[PDB]
Amino acid sequence: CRKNTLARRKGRHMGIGKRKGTANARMPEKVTWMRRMRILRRLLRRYRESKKIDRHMYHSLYLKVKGNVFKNKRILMEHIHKLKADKARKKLLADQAEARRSKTKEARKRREERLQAKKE
Amino acid sequence: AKRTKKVGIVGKYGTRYGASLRKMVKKIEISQHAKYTCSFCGKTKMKRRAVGIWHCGSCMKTVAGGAWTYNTTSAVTVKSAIRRLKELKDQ
Amino acid sequence: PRKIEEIKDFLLTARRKDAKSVKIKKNKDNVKFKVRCSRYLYTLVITDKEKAEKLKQSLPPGLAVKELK
Amino acid sequence: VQRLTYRRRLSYNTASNKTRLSRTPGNRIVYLYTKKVGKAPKSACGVCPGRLRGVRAVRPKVLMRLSKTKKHVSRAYGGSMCAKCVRDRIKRAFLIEEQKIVVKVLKAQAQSQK
Amino acid sequence: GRGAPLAKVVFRDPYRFKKRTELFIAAEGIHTGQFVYCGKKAQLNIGNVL
RNA sequence: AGAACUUUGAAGGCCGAAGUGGAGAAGGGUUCCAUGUGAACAGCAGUUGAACAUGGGUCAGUCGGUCCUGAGAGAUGGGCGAGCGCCGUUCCGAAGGGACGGGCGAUGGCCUCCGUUGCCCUCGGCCGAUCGAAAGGGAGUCGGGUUCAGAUCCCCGAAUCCGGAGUGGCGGAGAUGGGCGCCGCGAGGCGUCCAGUGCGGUAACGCGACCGAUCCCGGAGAAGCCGGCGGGAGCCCCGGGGAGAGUUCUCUUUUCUUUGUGAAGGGCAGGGCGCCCUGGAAUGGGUUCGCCCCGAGAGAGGGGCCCGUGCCUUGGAAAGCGUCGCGGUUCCGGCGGCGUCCGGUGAGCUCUCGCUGGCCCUUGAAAAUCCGGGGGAGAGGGUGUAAAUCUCGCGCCGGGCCGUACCCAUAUCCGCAGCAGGUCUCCAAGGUGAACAGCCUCUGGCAUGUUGGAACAAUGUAGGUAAGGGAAGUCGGCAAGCCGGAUCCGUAACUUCGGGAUAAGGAUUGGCUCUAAGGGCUGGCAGCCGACUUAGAACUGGUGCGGACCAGGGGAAUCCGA
RNA sequence: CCUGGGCAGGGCGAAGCCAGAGGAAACUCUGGUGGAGGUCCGUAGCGGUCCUGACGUGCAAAUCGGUCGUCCGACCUGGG
Ligand SMILES: [Mg+2]
Ligand SMILES: [Mg+2]
Ligand SMILES: [Mg+2]
Ligand SMILES: [Mg+2]
Ligand SMILES: [Mg+2]
Ligand SMILES: [Mg+2]
Ligand SMILES: [Mg+2]
Ligand SMILES: [Mg+2]
Ligand SMILES: [Mg+2]
Ligand SMILES: [Mg+2]
Ligand SMILES: [Mg+2]
Ligand SMILES: [Mg+2]
Ligand SMILES: [Mg+2]
Ligand SMILES: [Mg+2]
Ligand SMILES: [Mg+2]
Ligand SMILES: [Mg+2]
């Protein structure tokens, strides 16, 4: 029994012919979905509670994990990296444009102060 | 993904008891299984109790409704006639 | 049974009448004192052999004492 | 691997024969008998359901054992209302009595003006 | 054995201090907590027997 | 005396945890156990038995009946009836014999102080006497040991319930404070008055107790079935140690058994909350396997409560078990040494607890008992003296009656019998396997089912084949045989659009090496630990591979019945 | 009628829900989740189609072996 079980653990005696029940009978689709989605839904908790994802993309990726989109942990983590890089690029461009607009408005208010000082 | 194109909720009955009878049971099974808007707590928690009895989820205010919907059209007509005879010339 | 923590409460139990059995059980790391007063069994467990010896000395003499082995 | 046996002559798996299995000090799996579960008391007739908090949930013949601390709460309407009923009925009694006083003094003003 | 709902309307006894509980046929649109009135000069609403 | 059958050793097998096992309900009534006989009985036999004769055996506050009502059965009032009687169970009834209390009288004990008796006043729906469950409701005993036969009953040890308290058994609450004036260095003492039927937390609520009568209200008792999911136990699995045993032709740190804590009380895990406080969301947010929740208050933080059948602790190692040794003819629940240990994991099986949902012209029981709350009629000592009451910790006394053995069945029941028939339940191991399927093993039972020996004729009853043809036999493919599991392709006519459908028709399936993917726990991207699944590749065997077992022949139509 | 007890594993995948794509709108398409049913194969259980098999002075005054129909229900069953 132990030698046969060690062969099964290595992956032997588990071909096509020695399966006498269906795939859903051997490993259930519901159990596969439960394991898959519980792992993919608590990795988001370990990201959100520590550092990684914010409040608003957490709910979007939560619903996107509830839908059958993300197959496993590797491509889930890679898609989180892609969204984090895209958000960093968008906020960098927004900070540059806001700095340009802020320096323009500050220069305009200071020039209004210059013209007010020249008038009085 | 839309799976059933005509039977809707009646696909649990499958192939038995006639297209017209399944079509006539379809609308009233939708009526008995639909959640209705509660007029008291403002929520959508009107769950169907036994026949004639409707039961809102929050605030536990059980109401005596119709047998398959929340308000029968005949019952609304009766309520309108009762309030009309109420405020008609002070009885 | 009940577990008396303090020493004064256990010795007050020993002073209290309608108690007919005291059993001293030596153990490999401590020692247990048993009073069978009436329908309850009161235990004082203690880990100091000097305190056990002085409690055996201060035990009231009008009462039976049985040492378990 | 040690198949075990009933101890009473109740061979049928009824509600009173609701059991468990424990281990003796003599290293033998024994088939011990469990008292049925006791539910806590609930509130009085109309509030959202839920058992009242702070009551030792036992059988009513164990309520003879239970003393007058683990059966009620020190509040008025203690072991009967879940205190949401208390904080609603106090305000309801107060407001309806004050509105009856308002209606009575308005009718007294009607008596004075008529 | 009855498709019509039963209603459990509690009253108050004017002669002895005791709340009496009766069993009405539940009219349409009544809800728990509604003050169901009963008598001769009761105002005409749904639920009031007169 | 006598052995195919009795008993023991050993070998080989069967039952294989949905049993040929361990126990019960109904039923049997001594069949249970020991000793003796073998003329009866057991379909042969017995030295044997459930046969016969003799003698034993059933121990209960905490197991059940007893109590309660359920469907129902039933008597009085009443009505009917020639009549034994019949109807009916709230109807056409003067259908309660009880009580908080007050007054008056009398008796009795230690006539102060209490306990009784009678009369009067006052209060008090019964859903109507009563029966009806050894599976419904129903408080409370568990661990070890003992006999040839008993076991939760007997012995030891450890607990719990229900009643009892009058001269009211002992403690602890109620209980002991504040103000004023005088004396005194102060500590303290004296005199007067007043309070005191408990406290704490903002809360949900908590404690050692917390005055409560007629009356009223509420809860428990008191709930259907089916899905999911999570916690806990038991059993199984793996890694290591310790004790004994098995094999050693060669290998194997190998293989097998065991490795414990009852009820009860305290503490702590764990699970749950439709329980509270702060606080206010929108760029909507939090969570499920599925849902669901949120301004009638989400997230977050801090609390409170319930079950705690899990762990530790008194019980509790002194018993129990494993192993080695030593004394007594025997009697001693002998005597001694060592151990009775660390972990991990789970679509694992069973039981249990909890959350949530679905189903309904099905709403899935009553009563006995017990508790809480609202009311404040009443009771209590009135002060440096202590009560009225206690649902608190103790202590004392009692728990009457009946049943308790055994079979519970291919041999203790019924069927005329030791009859392939029938009869209601709990417990369930390892492997292959989806499986409580089928097959083989373990614990535990058994002698093959009312006979043995010799030979293997016809006919028969069950089972298997057969060259070539494939239904030509036959009323008819009757019987038998083919496909049968799983994975990947592909699926028609018709139709109520749901199906037909596992339609039909094909390919692969073994063994051994690999490869890839699917996780958790630790840190201010790195390291450790284990689960069994899927896919692909190479190599190899006599084309063999669901290798046994498990197990749909299919298609075209007609009539009838949805 | 009351009161209890019981039914291994798989196949089909309704409502509802999530995500993506198309569309101006109505809404439609795809992939999951979900577990509905007087639903299918099939065990115990319950009945008994065929062999008109075995018996047919039998095990039996109706039983046995294969082959069977159904097995969440208009399901089976004990006691009163
Ligand atoms: Mg699915
Ligand atoms: Mg019972
Ligand atoms: Mg064998
Ligand atoms: Mg059996
Ligand atoms: Mg003999
Ligand atoms: Mg004979
Ligand atoms: Mg005998
Ligand atoms: Mg005899
Ligand atoms: Mg006893
Ligand atoms: Mg009893
Ligand atoms: Mg009669
Ligand atoms: Mg008469
Ligand atoms: Mg009775
Ligand atoms: Mg016995
Ligand atoms: Mg015993
Ligand atoms: Mg007592």
Ligand SMILES: [Mg+2]
């Ligand atoms: Mg479970």
Ligand SMILES: [Mg+2]
């Ligand atoms: Mg577990």
Ligand SMILES: [Mg+2]
């Ligand atoms: Mg315990």
Ligand SMILES: [Mg+2]
């Ligand atoms: Mg017995």
Ligand SMILES: [Mg+2]
């Ligand atoms: Mg028989």
Ligand SMILES: [Mg+2]
């Ligand atoms: Mg016969």
Ligand SMILES: [Mg+2]
């Ligand atoms: Mg039989």
Ligand SMILES: [Mg+2]
């Ligand atoms: Mg197995």
Ligand SMILES: [Mg+2]
């Ligand atoms: Mg397996």
Ligand SMILES: [Mg+2]
């Ligand atoms: Mg089983």
Ligand SMILES: [Mg+2]
């Ligand atoms: Mg026989």
Ligand SMILES: [Mg+2]
């Ligand atoms: Mg025979």
Ligand SMILES: [Mg+2]
């Ligand atoms: Mg023989």
Ligand SMILES: [Mg+2]
């Ligand atoms: Mg041939």
Ligand SMILES: [Mg+2]
């Ligand atoms: Mg041939």
Ligand SMILES: [Mg+2]
């Ligand atoms: Mg041919």
